């Protein structure tokens, strides 16, 4: 086994998205192909936009609700995606079933004798599990030449309230995700929860840390192309005063920012070079 | 103990299933026969979809994977299955059991005198749950077959069984098909995205009776169907178990035990 | 120390029973005999048969209630069984004994004075232990040339009900092992608990994993015979409607399926070869 | 530290007891004497049986092993017992003790003013239990003897002592002998199947005073008897402790300390 | 470092006391003296004597209440005891102090309005510690040429009752150590707790496991003498019926059995030989 | 890192104190100076005694060690104390603090409607206790002195402070002195038997200014006295703290840093 | 890598302050400078002064309330302080938020019917953390040539009372730090808590254990000076009887004792030598 390392980077200063790619080329004598371990890190800003505090009856904010990362080779080349991390979780939780029974009797003495009998049956169930603000699962488009991940807003706690998500729906108050007060006597743009109370990934920066393992045929091209995409989906969260109470609504992927970079991989010399970039701004 | 590795990867566009297979030829000089460790990995999309019924657009249908299918099989008489993981196991649980008594007395300035007697029993059983349970459904010297089956899910107000007919249905939050069913953040990864299998088989091969064998590796899904519609200002929910069974892709690999060569022979469907 | 490995297998496709035997021959210079570590794995199907849903007042199902494995050498040979796993468990549990006492008095003031006192003595015991659906214990027929195990249905929980076993007996409702409802207004063949609620080993496949260590005299035969038996006992579980309530009954080993295989062991060349097989179907 | 191993195995058909004995000759050149580690293993069947009394068929008898007997002995004056496991130990327990007070006040719109005073004590003792406890019953330079004794058992209504006379008896579920007693799944393995002993002794041997020694290894059981019968619409249960004592097999091994040879000399009973 | 091992044994068949001594002679080049690690094991029977079941109004039993072990060299020789195990334990326990406060009010509406206010202050302390039936502490006669231990009855639980000891004293019932029932309508010789309920060391065999480290001057005698003593103190526990209730009393060291053995230690040749023995039976 | 070890052992008959001292000369060639590790061990008897007062035989006296004294000192200007164990430390405690509210409503068929409101606070502090606490009482470049002080004890009605004046006293179970005080099994080992010290000091020594130094190692006790007597059908208990202080033995060791020789010079008292 | 060790010490017998300095000079070939790991240990007495028991209406005691250690090089030399321990702690604690709800109904049958409905909402928060009597944080004067620490009285528990500190203030009783009883019918000099109840560091000796890592330029002076300062701040704690109740007050650093020592560091020969000392007694 012989190991060759290099690194490549690519910035979208405009979107505040940045790609750090770390490459480990592995020559393994027991293996008939070239191996490439590729770690994808860096930065994807949430694209968070504060609400206008001057907004009175109606207000809106934008928040980073989902992050998408993908790593791909080309259909015409000999490069396959053979393994990656993290993989989809078959979730585990702990369960406690308790059954209980009490029986008893009482007696008391006066002029006249008195008495009684008490009996009851308790039962219950307790479940124990881990709760995360954002959840990572594989992209449905994953295949033999492509792996992708969706890091999506999952269980978000307002205060003691929640957990809320992108589609939370109360029949009256709608989506209360970032709604501060149902009956607040305040400006709409001041009736959102405090910025600091919002989950880190909604308001700050996502720092991805994904891994992929790619294989390359020795009789293939000396050089091939790998495409890495960093992307953020920004949701429009808005609240409004109907005269009696406050209600909320969340509009998904109302804004999108995507940073796609293609890298030239030199399998022979174990070098890597940024070739092309694509910065796509979508708005609804 | 020298290892000779080969890999193969392939996707069925049709079914959205990807086989990522590692083949490790094990040259154990302490061992009587040829040996092969087959590591079966990849990605099987959930293919969870939400649709309006054609004949009845008011009726809303969620199709979702109740079970994931995984198997490895051979016809080569020279080949034996000598090990496989995971295997079926005996379930285990922690139990805590309590028996107690109370004997009370009391006095009051009424004046009165009071007595009391009491007995208590409680039992607590404690155990681990998985979203999906992995079961060996059949195995012999020529192959093994697993089913990864929907088991139990975390929800507000407790755990819910996969066999609960009202599962995933919800009071509609809109007119579209999707709105009649729980959001993504209330779905487990194995339904929201899909399954990443991780299975292993060790295979032996008799010497001097032929160099080539054929392996059939089958990945797939059994889809259930959940129906929801609104009648009389109320929600009617129904469930079809085994709505779409054996939605499977089968890939034939040819293994040359002497040259340590592995080729993809065929794939069905594409 | 020198180690020689091989494997042998044998299938009963009819019974869905399969034997995987793994052999480690150990030449140990500090030991005056030949050693054989023998791992027995594979498959024994439960023989589970679903009940007929059309059955009305009376119904029945078959379930895998016990699994028997045994490993033997021949009475005339020099081969002994010197060790094995698993062995019978001298069971351990934790006990917590609590004694408690509370004493107190109360007073209240108005026009007229009032008073009182309360006193209580609590005592209790808690036991903590492991509970398993199926239990593994040694066969009473175990001896110097034979080791055998019984993997038997042990503590089976209906829902919150149980634990039940093969011989559970309620004076009225009989054996409620797989009875769904005592007063269910349904078909008998639909009044069993859900298949999925049944323990894995009752309805699916047992995968044994037993171990044995055998010794062989160096002046003995170059070749000897080891007999390995895989077996399932199937119980007849039945329920019936007497007009008022449902009752149940479990009939043990009402069906039996046995797969016996004899292997030729070549102690000199460290080879193993399937010699004979025996497939026995018993029915009551 | 060179080891020379020998093994012997033998079964008493009569008593259904199997001795699996490992003999490890230890050539420790830092040590003044010959040394031998004897590993005593095997299988002692419970021989739990259920029957009808001959003279009184209505009376039902369960015979079961209260105690398992294990010992190793020698007559060779040149031989010393220099170590053995397990040994007797000082029992230990976790203790938690709590003392508390409550002092309450209250006001009501009766109007009334109320006072309150309260005191609480509790003690919890916490410890491990075994089905069977292992005790050294005697030991000296020529031998050692253990008794593995029935201690305590898990029951659905708490723990039960092995010395409880109503143990294992039950309200009959049929006419047969077996039905008057608890099912197999409520019996511990040491009664349902039997005992797998695991005992060890290290023995020294003086040099230049003879090459041969004789070891007597005795495995066995002490059976209790539990009786049950039905009279006057009620169940009568009785118990005979030490009903059948020293149901033992003795195997004589001859050890040659120079040739490192080990022979079975005799067995009683067969 | 060079290491030389040997062993010595000595039996008192009469007292059922037995000494196993294991010797490790250590030649250490960094040290100007000879070292001897000496492990003392074996058997000291409790001397337990069952009570006579035929005894009616009054009865007695004997139990092993304390075990004494000691290891010594001679005053005139160059052999010192430099270290040993176990040593006296500066005991540790866990404490939890809790202070608590609750305050609350209630209101009720009827024809007439009513009310109330409840307030209370809780405080408590919990201590957590290890409890052992017998306790091991050093002999006060320990010195530079002698180490000894007393393994003494410490905390003995009747059932839920206790812990009791050698000197437990209730003003009425005396010492209830092994008293079964305060008001039992039974024979005195049958009113002791069950044998099996007694601590292991009171009724069975003590197996000591002590360690000592001895030093010897190189210019000293080639041979010296070490004296090892194993001893049991047997207590007389007795109960009696006064007409109304049962009372108990424990008389300490009412019987004593002592086994002293002297061993010749050959520091030059690293041999050890039993020289003298002394079996002393004391009775009150 | 070569080590040269020496040992010394000695007992004071008078005080029943035994010093077991290990002297380890450390030849660290990376180090600028001579080095010596002194391991201070042994046995200090509790000397717990019970007696009748001479002048007043009805008054019962228990004398017991409140504190154990340990120190190591030198006069050699060429010698420095460069390390020692144990050292004084900052105490630590786990704290758990809880704030809560309850808001209740209720309805009765009187008919009446009820409301409820409640607030709860609780704080739990959790920490480790030793029978005796070890404190550095003084230390400098020429020596160090420790005191091992009675702290706290487990009692059946909670923990009791060593400074509690009623400590160890009990309702007499007889006429003798011993009977007025708690039994051995309610006494900690440090009172029932004594103390096994374990202390360490590392010492440096300047080169070329003399080969010999003198070390004074002092082991000892500070005895308290507890008095008990019966008057007016009641038990009167009193306590004298520091009744007998500095009951100490001092041993002088001479250390030759060049020859690596260690001699006992003197002992007071004998 | 090459390592050279030495030690130096300095005593203030008057103040009962003592400095042990341990030096590890590291020659590291991969590093262009000389390295010095310097461990500062020894003794700083608390300066504790018992109160006069004869004091009646008013009394006072002195206690060690804060300890200051510092390590410095000179402004004109090439020696920097590059690292040290301990560093300031970004403290962590564990939080448990619980929300709870119960609802139920009851019924009673006689001649006449009765009923009811009960409902409650509980919520709470629990915090878990470490509490220490004295706290260690860095001196604000810390810089590139100086590191210093303040080991200051932090959370001091009277009995169940507290935690108290140097500035604790009750509007009526003032600072109750070491006040025994609010309404005690005793002498002022006897109304302080027991000495033994006071934290170890307030009444006994502080044993510092600080570490510093210093760097030295190879072209610099062969010899440089390091200044090490050990210091105690003693607080005046006083109590007084106003006729009705007891009140307390704590006056900080009312006394100060400081021990400064300067050491000559020979970087070439890896020797260290005490050069100068400074013993400063401050009193208010």
- The distance of F161 to chain G (nearest Cα, Å) reads 10
Chain E residues with CB-CB distance to G131 below 8 A: none
E280 reaches D (C-beta below 8 A): no
Distance separating alpha carbons of residues E135 and E137, to the nearest angstrom: 7
Coil/strand/helix, residue G201:
helix
Which residues of G sit within 8 Å Cβ distance of A? 97, 99, 123
CB G223 within 8 Å of CB G187: no
- Check CB contact under 8 Å for E129 and F154: yes
Looking at beta carbons, which residues of chain G come within 8 Å of E97?
160
Looking at the complex, report in whole angstroms how far the Cα of residue E110 sits from the nearest Cα belonging to chain G.
Answer: 14
Residue in chain D lying closest to E204 (CA): D137
- Nearby residues of D12 by Cβ (< 8 Å), 6 or more positions away: D18, D249, D267, D269, D270
Using CB atoms within 10 Å of the CB of residue F112, give its burial: 0 to 12 exposed, 13 to 18 middle, 19+ buried. middle
Q: Which domain holds residue B90?
A: 1-270
- Can you tell me the distance from the alpha carbon of B18 to that of B194, in angstroms, rounded to the nearest whole number? 11
**What is the rounded CA–CA span in Å between residue F245 and residue G188?**
28
Measured in whole angstroms, how far is the alpha carbon of residue A90 from the centre of its chain?
Answer: 17
**Interface present between A and D (3 or more CB pairs within 8 Å):** no
**With contacts defined as CB-CB under 8 Å, which chain G residues touch F34?**
none
Question: First vs last Cα of chain E: how many Å apart?
Answer: 51
Ranges of beta strands (E only) in C110-245 are: 114-132, 134-138, 146-153, 205-206, 209-217, 223-241
**Residue C155 sits in which domain range?**
1-284
Question: Could you tell me which chain C residue has the CA closest to the CA of B139?
Answer: C43
- E135 and F185: CB-CB below 8 Å? yes
For residue C243, give both structure tokens. 């007009």
Q: What angle do CA C30, C225, C37 make, to 5 degrees?
A: 40
Asked if D97's CB is within 8 angstroms of F156's CB, the reply is: yes
Indicate which CATH number applies to the domain containing C54. 2.70.240.10
What does the alpha-carbon distance between residue B116 and residue A107 come to, in Å, rounded to a whole number? 6
Question: In angstroms, what separates the C-alpha of G90 from chain A's closest C-alpha?
Answer: 19
The most distant pair of C-alpha atoms in chain G lies apart, rounded to whole Å, by 107
G131 touches chain F (CB under 8 A): yes
* F to B contact (≥3 Cβ pairs closer than 8 Å): no
* Peptide bond just before C15 cis, omega within 30 deg: no
Interatomic CA distance for residues G186 and F38, integer angstroms: 48
Smallest Cα–Cα separation from A21: which of A3, A36, A41, A5? A41
| Contact between G45 and G201 (Cβ < 8 Å) | no
Instruction: Count other C-beta atoms under 10 Å from residue B219's C-beta.
Output: 26
Whether chain D has a CB inside 8 Å of the CB on C124: the answer is no
* Cβ E192 vs Cβ E61: under 8 Å: yes
Q: What is the Cα–Cα distance from G207 to F134, expressed in whole angstroms? A: 13
Joined together, the tokens standing for residue B59 give 């009726």
CA B58 to chain centroid:
32
Total tally of structural domains belonging to chain B: 1
What is the Cα–Cα distance from A258 to G161, expressed in whole angstroms? 60
Q: State how beta strands D112-130 and C92-109 pair.
A: antiparallel
Residue pair E238/E187 in contact by the 8 Å Cβ criterion: no
Cα–Cα distances (Å) from D132 to B137, D67, D87, E157, in that order, read 39, 8, 15, 20
Q: In Å, how far are C59, D26, D207, G253 from D34, measured between CA atoms?
A: 71, 7, 7, 75
Count Cβ–Cβ pairs < 8 Å, chain F vs chain G: 149
- Give CA–CA dist B66/B162, Å, rounded: 8
Please list, in sequence order, all residues whose beta carbon lies within 8 angstroms of the beta carbon of residue A266, skipping any fewer than 6 positions away. A222, A223, A272, A273
CB atoms closer than 10 angstroms to residue G103:
10
In angstroms, the separation between the Cα of residue G97 and the nearest Cα of chain A is: 8
| Closest chain C residue by Cα to residue D118 | C104
Q: How far apart are CA G67 and CA G256, in angstroms?
A: 10
The length of chain D is 270
What CA–CA distance (Å, rounded) separates D175 from D59?
Answer: 11
CA A201 – CA A156 distance, rounded (Å): 11
Q: Are E163 and E156 in contact (CB under 8 A)?
A: yes
Nearest to D65 by CA among D198, D224, D197: D224
User: Which residue from E minimizes the CA distance to F185?
Assistant: E154
Chain E environment of C123 (Cβ under 8 Å): 160
**Chain D residue closest in CA terms to B96:** D158
Identify how the structure was determined.
X-ray
Closest CA to A226 of A240, A218, A237, A215: A215
List chains adjacent to chain F, taking adjacency as at least 3 C-beta pairs closer than 8 Å.
D, E, G
SS3 G189: helix
Helix (H, G, I), strand (E, B) or coil at C182: coil
Tell me the shortest Cα–Cα distance from F61 to chain E, in angstroms: 19
User: Degrees (nearest 5) of the Cα angle F190, F192, F194?
Assistant: 40
Q: Using beta carbons and an 8 Å cutoff, which residues of G are at the interface with E? A: 160
CA angle G195, G199, G202 (to 5 degrees): 80
Positive or negative torsion for Cα B74, B80, B82, B88 = positive
Three-state DSSP at G234 gives strand
Domain tally, chain E: 1
In this complex, which chains have at least 3 CB pairs below 8 Å with chain C? A, B, D, E
Task: Mark yes or no for CB contact F18/E144 under 8 Å.
Answer: yes
Q: How far apart are CA G68 and CA G44, in angstroms?
A: 10
Structural resolution in Å: 2.5
CA–CA gap between residue G264 and residue G223 (Å, rounded): 7
Q: List chain A residues with CB under 8 Å of B146.
A: none
Shortest Cα–Cα distance, C98 to chain B (Å): 9
The token pair at C3 is 């180690």
How many C-beta atoms lie closer than 10 Å to residue E89's C-beta? Answer: 16
Q: For residues B204 and A12, what is the distance between their CA atoms, to the nearest angstrom?
A: 53
Alpha-carbon distances, residue A85 vs A130, B38, B81 (angstroms) = 20, 20, 29
Window G:175-234, CB contacts with F under 8 Å: 194, 196, 199-201, 204-207, 209
Give the max Cα distance, chain F: 102
User: For position B234, which CATH number holds?
Assistant: 2.70.240.10
| Bond into A64 cis (ω within 30) | no
Instruction: Look up residue A129 and give its two tokens.
Output: 């599990």
F189: nearest CB among E83, E91, E167: E91
Q: Could B173 and A150 be called an inter-chain contact, meaning their C-beta atoms sit closer than 8 Å?
A: no
* Rounded-to-integer distance, Cα E33 and Cα E217, Å: 5
What residues contact residue D253 under an 8 Å CB cut-off, 6+ apart? D8, D21, D23, D214, D215, D216, D217, D262, D263, D264, D265
Cα-Cα-Cα-Cα torsion C248, C252, C256, C258, nearest 10 degrees, comes to 130
Size of interface C-D (CB pairs under 8 A): 167
CA distances from residue G135 to G130, G151, G259 in whole angstroms, order as listed: 11, 5, 21
SS3 C273: strand
């Amino acid at each position: 086994v012989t190991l060759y390392k290099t690194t490549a980077t690519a910035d979208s200063d405009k979107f505040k998205i940045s790609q750090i790619l770390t490459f480990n080329f592995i020559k393994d004598k027991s293996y008939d192909k070239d191996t490439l371990v590729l770690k994808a890190t860096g930065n994807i800003n949430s694209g968070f936009v504060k609400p206008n505090p001057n907004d009175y009856d109606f207000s809106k904010l934008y928040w980073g609700a989902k992050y998408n990362v993908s790593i791909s080779s080309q259909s015409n080349d000999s490069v396959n995606v053979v393994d990656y991390a993290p993989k989809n979780q078959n979730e585990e939780f702990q369960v406690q079933n308790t059954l209980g029974y009490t029986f008893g009797g009482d007696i008391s003495i006066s002029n006249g004798l008195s008495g009684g009998l008490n009996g009851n049956t308790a039962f219950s169930e307790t479940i124990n599990y881990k709760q995360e603000s954002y959840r990572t699962t594989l992209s449905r488009n994953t295949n033999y030449k492509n792996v992708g991940w969706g890091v999506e807003a999952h269980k978000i706690m307002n205060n003691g309230w929640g957990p809320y998500g992108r589609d939370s729906f109360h029949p009256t108050y709608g989506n209360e995700l970032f709604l501060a007060g149902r009956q607040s006597s305040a400006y709409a743009g001041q009736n959102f929860i405090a910025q600091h109370q919002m989950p880190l990934l909604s308001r700050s920066n996502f720092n991805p840390e994904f891994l992929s393992v790619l294989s390359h045929r020795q009789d293939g091209a000396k050089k091939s192309k790998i495409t890495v995409t960093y992307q953020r989906e920004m949701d429009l969260y808005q609240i409004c005063w109907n005269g009696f109470y406050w209600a909320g609504a969340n509009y998904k992927n109302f804004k999108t920012r995507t940073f796609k970079s293609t890298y030239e991989i030199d399998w022979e010399n174990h070098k890597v070079k940024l070739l092309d970039t694509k910065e796509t701004e979508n708005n609804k | 103990a020298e290892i000779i590795k080969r890999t193969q990867d392939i996707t069925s566009k049709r079914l959205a299933i990807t086989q990522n297979i590692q083949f490790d030829f094990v040259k154990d000089k302490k061992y009587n026969k040829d040996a092969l460790v087959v590591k079966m990995q990849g990605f099987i999309s959930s293919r969870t979809t939400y649709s309006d019924l054609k004949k009845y657009p008011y009726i809303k249908r969620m199709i979702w994977p109740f079970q994931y299918n995984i198997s490895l099989k051979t016809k080569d008489s020279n080949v034996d299955l000598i090990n496989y993981l995971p295997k079926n196991k005996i379930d285990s649980a922690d139990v805590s059991q309590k028996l107690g008594y109370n004997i009370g007395g009391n006095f009051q300035s009424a004046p009165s005198i009071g007595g009391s007697g009491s007995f208590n029993y409680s039992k607590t059983i404690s155990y681990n749950q998985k979203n999906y349970v992995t079961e060996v459904e059949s195995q012999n010297s020529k192959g093994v077959k697993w089913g990864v089956k929907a088991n139990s899910f975390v929800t507000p107000n407790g755990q819910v069984s996969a066999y609960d007919q009202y599962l995933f249905a919800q009071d509609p939050t809109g007119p579209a098909a999707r709105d009649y069913f729980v959001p993504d953040n209330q779905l487990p990864p194995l339904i929201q995205s899909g399954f990443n299998p991780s299975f292993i088989t060790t295979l032996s091969h008799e010497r001097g009776k032929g160099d080539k064998s054929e392996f059939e590796i089958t990945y797939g899904r059994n889809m259930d169907a959940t129906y929801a519609y609104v009648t009389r200002h109320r929600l009617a929910v129904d469930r079809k178990h085994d709505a779409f069974k054996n939605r499977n892709v089968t890939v034939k690999y040819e293994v040359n035990w002497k040259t340590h060569e592995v080729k993809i022979k065929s794939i069905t469907p594409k």
